[PDB]
Ligand SMILES: NS(=O)(=O)c1c(F)c(F)c(SCCO)c(F)c1N[C@H]1CCc2ccccc21
């Protein structure tokens with residue numbers, strides 16, 4: 081298929097080919113903090129990341145994707161709401177066409193300029209990321225907000241590659257990536273059961289959305305909007321915006337890691 | 340000079356370093372019913388580059404793995420810590436017998452050995468030397484060792500020991516994946532304390548992990564084959580190098596977990 085974020089193929093149209101778009105556990109969501117409850121049963125979060133696990137960065141047409149060697153438990157997410165070990169697989173980013181909004185999750189009506197997703201899968205139960213994405217307990221995703229602020233030096237390894245991956249399908253070697261340092265200092269989070277935010281919109285994600293944003297400067301953010309959603313030899317169109325709006329909770333409750 | 344033998348060992352260290360009898364000395368008894376769970380403590384944020392290790396030596400008091408601490412390739416953040424603490428050195432404490440070799444003791448349980456991973460506050464101080472004399476200067480991660488399966492990462496250290504038998508001997512050592520050596524759970528206790536060797540400076544934020552890592556008996560025993568004496572001196576073996584627990588003196592020990 082040819083879903084994307086343009087007029088005819090964008091979010092409002094995804095239900096034409098992916099009716100789970102109007103499902104009961106869709107993401108992203110709005111977090112109403114007055115209705116969130118602290119859950120003391122959550123375990124400490126554990127983030128063990130190895131910079132050598134990163135392999136390549138590519139333009140998927142819908143974002144950049146940093147892909148990690150995942151046949152190995154060198155980079156794993158454990159604890160918090162999770163049972164077992166979730167292997168790091170992917171990092172990508174969502175933004176809007178201007179700085180004032182662009183994040184996917186929205187907390188008490190506040191948008192941010194962008195939102196990073198860190199995708200992991202349950203290799204204690206499932207044989208592959210692809211399989212795990214079809215199971216309710218299969219995926220765990222960290223959401224990190226990016227607010228306009230002074231430039232963030234931890235985005236340089238990414239931003240330095242963008243010209244090399246301007247067209248859809250381009251890739252480049254990308255290793256020795258310090259993902260850990262791209263996370264904010266506080267890992268306090270909200271957690272809820274939801275979905276991929278792109279087709280196929282599978283309801284397989286335990287979301288772990290960090291409260292504290294990181295910074296990005298407008299000049300850094302603008303470079304992402306210079307990526308294309310089209311391949312070499314196809315009429316050029318820019319990936320100026322790639323975020324899905326929040327979907328209704330439909331009865332789900334959001335839990336907080338913090339009082 | 341100070342050591343761990345009868346005339347120069349821990350009970351005599353105060354005779355040359357009077358802070359041995361200070362109010363924030365380490366190690367301690369960790370009594371779990373007395374520890375305070377603190378929800379403000381953060382999970383450890385750990386980044387260790389395997390290329391940072393450069394040299395292993397025999398100090399006469401332990402082995403020491405020295406890391407290149409020129410810049411922030413290998414840092415510890417989070418936990419109880421404000422700011423970034425740069426990796427400097429790793430060393431080990433053990434005893435003459437496998438069931439009593441750690442420094443920290445948990446509800447009376449000694450472990451077979453204890454690894455110390457030493458870091459310094461480069462966000463506030465320009466060097467390890469300046470950080471080592473200030474109460475927020477150092478962060479040390481303590482990791483217990485229990486007897487079990489040979490540890491393939493510790494085998495890399497044990498393989499070097501014949502080459503550093505004498506005090507002052509050094510040999511090149513790198514590609515040490517310290518992050519992978521750590522146990523599965525990074526839950527910890529923390530308290531303010533000190534170096535556990537002279538000069539016993541009270542500059543250490545201690546972070547003691549609850550879950551041990553394993554080592555075989557035979558691997559552990561090889562560390563007792565190091566000498567506390569230099570080439571040309573009468574040989575004496577480092578069969579034990581752990582300091583006894585010190586009075587808590589009203590410090591609060593906190594837990595990251597409950
Ligand atoms: N950079 S170093 O090799 O010197 C050193 C380290 F790297 C350390 F990690 C430590 S921690 C104590 C356990 O070995 C030092 F004490 C020292 N020793 C220093 C610490 C300050 C001091 C005072 C008097 C004698 C020696 C020392």
Ligand SMILES: [O-][Cl+3]([O-])([O-])[O-]
Nearest residue numbers: 370373587588589
């Ligand atoms: O439990 Cl205390 O030994 O510090 O009184």
Ligand SMILES: [Zn+2]
Nearest residue numbers: 172174197277
């Ligand atoms: Zn996403």
Ligand SMILES: [Zn+2]
Nearest residue numbers: 430432455535
């Ligand atoms: Zn020590």
